[PDB]
Each structure stands twice: as C-alpha cells, then as structure tokens.
Symmetry: C4
Subunit: 310 residues, 4 copies
C-alpha cells in the first residue's frame, strides 16, 4: 500500500475457524446460541417420537387392551415434546412409561442421551474459554536535545491504569540499493531505543518520550531536513507490555511516514504538579510545539562540532 | 503524591469488572454465593410453577372429580416447591406428575432447564478459575567497596522455599533539564545492576546485597555526601522471579527515596555458617552498621586518585 | 545420519503416553470413541443386571405373586438393557423399580453410579483439552552485499496474515578439530544474524532475506568457493515468531548441507510493486538467479582488500 | 551445609497446601479418593434419613392402614440408603415416595443437592488440574582446549527428544572477601558460558561439553591445580530447555565442589561412530580420562606465555 502498517495496530470458506471464533463472542450471544441448540435438539427428538407414534396413533389411544398396537412412551398425542424434554434433560417423571417390552426403536433414546452429553460437553467447553489501551503520538518529532539531534515519539496509556514494565522496539523499513546493485524492496533496519544499555524496558506510569539518538550507527545518521521530505522511509514501533494481573505482552503497533515526522518541533509537557497530584492532560498529550532545532544534517552537525574543537 | 511508588508494590458502574473480581473470591465466599444463587432459583421457580395451577388449585385440590379440571400437576397449594426442586435438580420424582396431558404451559419447564444448565455452567466456570514473598531493605546504603564507591540494597526471600531465576532491574526517576531548556518531569535512566554481564539474572538462596557500582555511566557519578541529601531523586527496583516449587512468575516492586538512601553504611551479616547450617537472622536484614567511607563523590574520588597520581 | 536435521522440522507399550496422545485426537475420532465407550459401559451394566436377577428371573417373573421372590427390579429377562440405560444416564423412569424388598443385593447400582460419574468426569476433561507456518529457502545462497561477502537464506511466511516479532537463531554444527587433538563429532558454533545489533527480533510482512556477514568472528570466515563443496558443515536455523492474529510460538528447523549452500546466487524478489500494489508470490520464493559473486575466500578477499588499501 | 546445592536439583499446620498436594496425586489415587468421598456423602445422608425415621418409625410405616405417621419418604426400615442414592445422584424412581404433604422438614433434600453438586464440581476440578530428563557430568573437568585453559562440564538429555533452546547459566558461589574486611558468605559471580556471545541457547541432540574459557574476567583466573583443593569454590549450573512439541520449560539444577573439579581430564566422546554411523552411549557420558595439560595457573600461564613472547 502507500502506508505499510496502519496507525491502529494492523498491517496493510472454512468450517473449523468459524467454530473457533464462535467461542470468542459476547456473553449474550453465547447464552443465546447455547439455548437455541438445546431447543433444536429437543424439537428434533420430539418429532422423532411422533414418527414412532405412527405405529399406534389410532389403534388403542385409550383402549388399553393387553396390546395397544405396540404402544411406546405411552403418549396419545403429537404433543409428546414432554417425553423428549424429560429424556434429554434426564428428568424422566414416569407419568409417561419410559417404554413397553414392545420392540420399538429404543436406539432413539440411546441417541438422545449420547447427543445431549456431547452437545452439553461442547457448550461447557465454549462457556469455559469465553469466561476464562496504549497510545502513541500522532506526529513523531525531531528535536535537538543535550547537544544531539534526536527522534522522539511519545508513549502513554489513556486509562488511569498503566501496564508497567513495558518494552519498546523500533524498525525502520525502507528500500535499499546495495553496492553490487541489489534492490531490496523492503529493507528492515533496527533502530536503537536503548537496547544496548538495557533502556528498552521502561515504566510508563506517566506519558513519556521514547528517544532515539541519531549517531553514526543509527539509520538516520545522514538524514537532513533537506532530503527528509522526499525519502519514503517508514518507522514501525511495537510495544510489548505484561499486564499487571496475569501479565502477557500485548503488541501495540504504530507507524510514522515521512509526513508524520516533523523537524524543528518537540512534544509539549503533559505533567504539571498541583496539590501533590500531577495534572496529566491527554488533550495536549499529542500536541507539539516549535523549538529552535538546527536544520543541518546530524553528520553535518558532528562535523561542525569537530571543526569547533580543532 | 511526592513519593512516586510506595514501598509495598503499589504506584502512587462496570458489570464485567465486578463479575471478574467475583470469580477471584475466597473458597468460602465462592461456595456461599454458589448455594445462594441456587436457593434463589429454586424459590422463584416454585412461585412461578404455583401460578400455573391457580385456576385448578382451589377447584379440586384433592377432590379429583372424574379427572376434570386436570391441573397439569398433582401438587397441592402448600409446599409445591418440591416440584421446583425436582425440575431444576433433574431428580424428577413421579409422586407429582411433571405435566398432565392437559396442555396449560409446558414452557415453564424449558425455562427452568436452560436456566439451571446455564447457572450450573457459570458456577462451575467460576469454581474452575478460583481453584486453578520477596523483601527489600528498609534503607538502601552507599559505601566504598573493593576500591570503588558503590550503592547497595538487600534483596531477600521471606520463605525458605526458593525463588529461582530472580532478575533485578533498577530505574532512577529524577527531573532532567536538557541543554535546549525543555524540562522532563519524570526522566527514567537505567542503573547497571549487572545487565551486561548477566549478573542481573541471579538465584537468591538467602538475602544477597545487590550492588551497583557508581561509575562514569552511573546516574550517581557526581554525587558527594553533601549532594545526596539535596537531591530528591527516587529509585524504583523490581525483582521478577519464579518459584522453585512451581513455575509461576512473581514481580515484586519497591522504592527508595532520598530519606531512605543512607551514606557511609554497610549491611550487617544475615548468614553465619556453623552447627551444620547457615544461622539465618531477618532481624539484622533491615538493620545496618556504619562504616568509614570517603565523603567525596565517586567522580571526586577518581579525581582524588588522579591527584595521588599527580 | 548423512543429514543431521531434516528439512521439515525433525531431527534425525506405555499406557500413560498413548492415553496422553489419545486426548490429542481429531474431533470426529474423539466423539466416536466417546459414544462407543458410553455404549460399551451401558452394554456391561445390562448384562450384570441379568445375573443379579438370575435367581428370581423365573421364580416370581412367571408367578407375578405378592412379595414372593420379588425380583431386584420389576423387569423381564429380555430387553433388560432399558434398566441399565435408565440407571447409568440418571433418567430413573420408574416403570422398572430401582430396588425391591427381598433385594438379593443392591450393591451393583452403587458401582454403576460411581463408574458412570468417573467416566463422564474423565471424558469431559479430554474433550476440554482437545477443544481448548514458515518456509525456508531450499538453497541458502552466498552473495556480495554492501562491499562484503554474505551468507543469506530466505524466510517466508506462507500465511497471508503476517508473522510478527520473529527471532532467528543460526547454529553451525561441524566436526571441529581442536589444537589439543580432541575431535569433537558435533561442535556447535553460533552464527551472528544480528543478535548484538538487535536485528534478530525481526518483523516480516513478506518473505525476507536473513543475512549473515562473514567477518573474523564468523564460523565460515575462511570457507572458500573451491572448498564450499568439500566441507561437511551443516547449518540449523530456528525461527520463533508470533502471528499477527495470535501470539503463537513455533519452531522451524532447517538444514543447509554443503551442497545446498550455493556460491554465486541471490534470491528472487517475492514482492511485486504496481503503483502501490504489493503482491506476494510463494511460487518464486525458492528461485535464485546468479551473480558474479567473488569466488575468493572471505578471509582471503579481506586480506586482498587490505593489501590494496596499503 | 557442606554442599550448598545437591546434585539432583535440590538446594540444601497448613489447611490450604494439603488440598494442592491432594490435586497433585496419581490418577488411581484421585479416582480412589473421589469414590471414597461419594460413598461417605451417600452413607452420611442415609443415616440422616434413618434419623428422620425417628418421628414415624412404624405407626403406619409398614401396615399403612391410615395416613397417620405418613412418612417423609415411604421407607419401612433403617436400610433407606436406596433413597439416599436416588436423591443425591438424581435417579429418583418414585417406588420410594419422594415427599409427602405432612413432612417435618424437606430442607435435607436441598442440603443433599447442594453438597452433591459441590462434591461433583470439586472432584471434576481436581481431575481436570491433574490431567491438564537433563543430566550432568558427575564431576566437572578443567582441561587445555584449543591452546587455552578451559573449564568443561558435559551436559545432555537422556531422552532422544530434540529439546530446543537449552539455555545454560553458571553461577560460582564463594566466600569472597572485600578490601573493607566484610566478606559476603555467599558471593554469586557470573561465569561466561556464552551469554555475551549468544551461544547460551545450545541444542542437546548429542551430549555436548559446555566450555567456559578462563580469562582475566573469569572467576578462576588465578586458580591452579595444586591450589584447587584448598579453595571452597562451588559451581551451580542451571539449564532451561523446551521440548519439541511446544513443551513447557524444564529447569535442571546441578552443582560441583572443589574436589569434584579435576585437572587434565577430558570427557571421552559420548557418541563414537560405529560402522559409519556415530553411536550414542549414555553409559560413556560420565566417563573421563587423564590428558596431558600444564599444571600452572591460568593467570600464571598467561604471564609465562607473555614472557616467552615478550
């Protein structure tokens, strides 16, 4: 596409996967499907019972002789759904005699019991799996901090709750042409976010600015304001944080195209102490303000520094 | 609050969230709620079942004249809750006929069956999730050790059962002022407790003093004894380890403020080995005993060594 | 063997183990064995009942007298499987009485009930455990990249969903000869695929070329194009990554024997770019087209470059 | 103790942990205890039913001339354990009267139902939790490898399964003495078994000799053969591996002592080729032989080599 990975976390005929994702449903949808399957099974078994009643429908409905046709289930009407409910739900009341010695399809009862236990097991499994928030800045910025040009992207958690001890990874994807003439459509170069020093794992208790220093080994070493607009480089940032309870790393992914990166601006502070509690403005959490950042190349700035040292 | 993370492990209208907290309950609380929901279901079902026979309940309670006004039940006005218990718990005794041929409403027993299965499934699921110790020094200290100024804090296991694969990470939170003049309220800079050499990952069999050397890279590089009181920088130290008995990872957080960071001290001995075993005293683990350590800063101590070189 | 680890992922009387793998069965096989075992348990219960009633199967069956050799149950000798189905499935219809005076032993019912509960409990857990792809290029290649010789192997995600957070680890197993004189049959030397730089934890949208630079530290540092056929060195590469949809860890072992690792070839581009249209074809993933890669030994080539520099 | 951690993996009043130990039982023990629990529940309820027989023992209990002393359950004798089995496991027949309209309390049925459901749920949960190989060389050896002194300890997996990512970590515990005169009784100093080079996650298809080179940073940098016995160094090695089929992490802990470390010893090849195919001999795993090595210290050896080369 134009943008490789979208800003939310997405990059840009099967009868088994539908069953797998059916367990991943809202509780109301799950209970609704759970009642519907049972109702269908009861209705089908009741229809089966009426088909077994074709043998004795009119011969001795109330004659009660020594042999009434071959009475099975002792029910005189098509409303034998009572017998079906009692057999499936294992609540046989005996008002309807389970069966006579007459050779009916007792195997129909064998099917109801196994099917019910199997349907019940499936429903229990579906109930078991079903019952058992990070934000990045809109515009990553470039600013001059502590004598070095740096690339800054802010990270936070919108909710008051924060998933502490997060880890950050940054990958710059852009096309590279090598010395031999090899063209790689999507070259991936990792960005230092403190991995060497162990600074990747950090606390986000407040919204904080993740900083990549531009240096000789950095992918941006020779990036300058002059050519940064044209270059199609794309930055993709993945954040993995283990939740406070039953912690598991959740991948919060964002992207920054050359348009989103801004030169000469830096994020505007989000923390201000009032009455011992630090006001956190999520409205200004993304907002960036102009700073006096040199427009020369980072390598050019280093060369100017060495010239000054002499 | 002025102190960011407290010493214990804490930093300083929803139907689903309360339901999630309810599954996380004591065993006694869980069995109590499990019996209470069933009792409510049985009582409600008894009342609703009583409503169906209201027309024939007084018409012929025991008269049964020529089997007329069939009640769709053989139950009497009082203690008809037995029919509710039989329907919900699937005992299905035939003393009271579940449903007479007279139709009335047979859908009441369908509702009871689905509700009972659903309530049973939810209770089983809540029961399934329910069934299925590190300590830090009160005061961190600084002393001269092995020719280098160092910062030490005790880390111990309260229970004799060991915690394997303990990893210790220390992050110092203080407000940095950049060269540009952009103020960072909560700048987090990592402290090297052995991450490079793999000394970070340690097996704690007894309380062991984790030590960070104050070198050029250390945030404390230029902290003299006079400076340590002045600065309000805070340490946050986290130990993540799994139990020896079971592979369950526990994360224990702790904090240290300038008030609890002492100078010219060293921890006392927790273990003295004699009589066939280590003599373990946790009385002295929190306690410290003073030492004579140069008041000059670590950078200043290296400067003093340079002066000795002259 | 000739090849240590095969190309797919494989390297080259117990009641508990077969039982453990039995839970890992196809859904159809599991439901089939479940219904079959339930039917078998029911068939056995019916047979034991005939033996229990064997003494009174005639004596009071023919007489139909009052409490005189009254049978254990009010059932006939033939079609007595109904009693077993009712007792085991907990239907308890009551046309046949559960136990009578002059019982002749009611112990069988206790055994049947415990066995039935145990069977259901055991086979619900099996149902629960049961209900609750990266391709490597066939031929690793050697190409001249960025002014240095490099060993590169293509990794492809067959699934349209992109694999995320993939870590690559490469180990060269060779018959190392020590200077001491010890001959190590299977000496494992790790290969640097970006571990220090952090490039191992790569993000693959499309099949990408994993590259190892042949430097002094590299195991194949002195390997030569003439000797590339001679050697018996084998490369084992393992990829552990998370799917975008799900965080599932997998292992994909591969082998690159002396013959499979070509010299002078570079991979075929998988991605087709059409005005922002990205197409990934796995038909061309394995193809390699030749380049005039320098055939001198990497160490020899570096030394020649050094001599040229002078 | 004399030895801190034993060679197998061990280092050297509660009503909650007993339940955990009971869930952690053999399958036979779990089914046995469950059947015993069911028998206890039924037997206790049956007595209680005989106690309910106190109010109406024989007034119309047998003869039944009138409804006087109409029984809660129509059971003539103390052997009313048929009623207990029927009520608790929900197979009520009705040959024995379920309830009457003259009872002294039918709360016992409610108690029986709740206890039975709770017992079944607990016994299903226990069954669910219940249903749902590394070895080291007996004595480590210090030998001359590739012209440099090294510490070698052989580790392998007995089962042929291809355990993956068998990361190995070595910690040397000794009573190190500081310049201050305060000696930590246990000082954990990390040993570089490949963590710096990324060689730690070794494969164990063939038993393989883990090698630690002795350099300036190595703990044994100054140790010598004749001086090895006097020292108190204790080496503890922990190996973590995963089985092929996404197996759970398995942690094996082993130890060594001063007299279990030997000089000029090389493990004999665990696998020796037979008939053109290498043969695995777990009998030869622990086997060692005396090899020709120099007896001087590693630091002293380095100084001697430097003197020879000036």
């Amino acid at each position: 596409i134009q943008r490789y990975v979208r800003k939310d976390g997405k990059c840009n005929r099967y009868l088994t996967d539908i069953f797998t994702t059916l367990v991943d449903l809202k509780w109301r949808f799950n209970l609704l499907i759970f009642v519907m399957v049972y109702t269908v099974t009861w209705l089908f078994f009741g229809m089966i019972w009426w088909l077994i009643a074709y043998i004795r429908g009119d011969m001795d409905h109330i004659e009660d002789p020594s042999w009434t046709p071959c009475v099975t289930n002792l029910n005189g009407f098509v409303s034998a759904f009572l017998f079906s409910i009692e057999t499936e739900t294992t609540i046989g009341y005996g008002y309807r005699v389970i069966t006579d010695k007459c050779p009916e399809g007792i195997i129909l009862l064998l099917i109801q019991s196994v099917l019910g236990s199997i349907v019940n097991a499936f429903m229990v499994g579906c109930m078991f799996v079903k019952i058992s928030t990070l934000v990045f800045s809109t515009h990553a910025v470039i600013s001059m901090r502590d004598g070095k040009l740096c690339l800054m992207f802010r990270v936070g958690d919108l909710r008051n709750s924060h998933i502490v001890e997060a880890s950050i990874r940054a990958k710059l994807i852009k096309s590279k042409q090598t010395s031999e003439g090899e063209f790689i459509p999507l070259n991936q170069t990792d960005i230092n976010v403190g991995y060497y020093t162990g600074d990747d794992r950090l606390f986000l208790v407040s919204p904080l600015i993740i900083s990549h220093e531009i240096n000789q080994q950095s992918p941006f070493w020779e990036i300058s304001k002059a050519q940064l607009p044209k270059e199609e480089l794309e930055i993709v940032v993945i954040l993995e944080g283990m939740v406070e309870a039953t912690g598991m790393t959740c991948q919060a992914r964002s992207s920054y195209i050359t348009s989103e990166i801004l030169w000469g601006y830096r994020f505007t502070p989000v923390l201000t102490l009032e009455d011992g509690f630090y006001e956190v403005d999520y409205n200004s959490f993304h907002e960036t303000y102009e700073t006096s950042t040199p427009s020369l190349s980072a390598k050019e700035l280093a060369e100017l520094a060495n010239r000054a040292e002499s």
